[PDB]
């Protein structure tokens, strides 16, 4: 993975935008790295991205089937940034959801902190 943040060219030692140290997050696939805050993640997302092998937008696959086809149907979870095809969920979705959307894994983990709530 890259020892530098794509967005600020900084380190784990220095976020060049904020001035403080901040762990890098790396694409588990192509290695590109960013600071969670440079990636503009909510501090809930900034967390959850570290509990699994995060994939950047270019490398993202459906967590369910594993393929990267049908990008026009690949939903992003607003908490963990994993991808889920609408047709892989149960029930199937015919339409993209409205507003925030939280996947099952985040509902179980983040509970009331998931985006889908108030
Ligand atoms: Zn950065
Ligand atoms: Zn990638
Ligand atoms: Zn799928
Ligand atoms: Zn999620």
Task: Describe the 3D structure.
With 118 residues, the protein is low in regular secondary structure. It has a single domain, classed as 2-Layer Sandwich (Herpes Virus-1). It is built from 2 helices and 4 strands. The strands form 2 sheets. The chain has a two-stranded antiparallel sheet. A two-stranded antiparallel sheet has the order 3-4. The termini are far apart. One zinc ion is lined by residues 62, 64-65, 85, 88.
Strand content: 5-15%
Intertermini distance:
36 Å
CATH class category label: Alpha Beta
**Integer-rounded radius of gyration:** 15 Å
The tally of structural domains comes to: 1
Order of helices and strands: EEHEEH
Q: What general form does the structure show? A: globular
Give the CATH superfamily: Zinc/RING finger domain, C3HC4 (zinc finger)
Major beta sheet, strand line-up:
1-2
Estimated helix fraction: 10-25%
* Main sheet specs: 2 strands, antiparallel
Ligand list: zinc ion
Shape-level CATH architecture: 2-Layer Sandwich
CATH fold call:
Herpes Virus-1
PDB class: metal binding protein
Keywords: DPF2, metal binding protein
Assembly: monomeric
Entry title: Crystal structure of DPF2 double PHD finger
Produce the secondary structure layout.
Layout: E1 25-26, E2 33-34, H1 43-48, E3 74-76, E4 83-85, H2 104-110
Antiparallel strand pairs: 1-2, 3-4
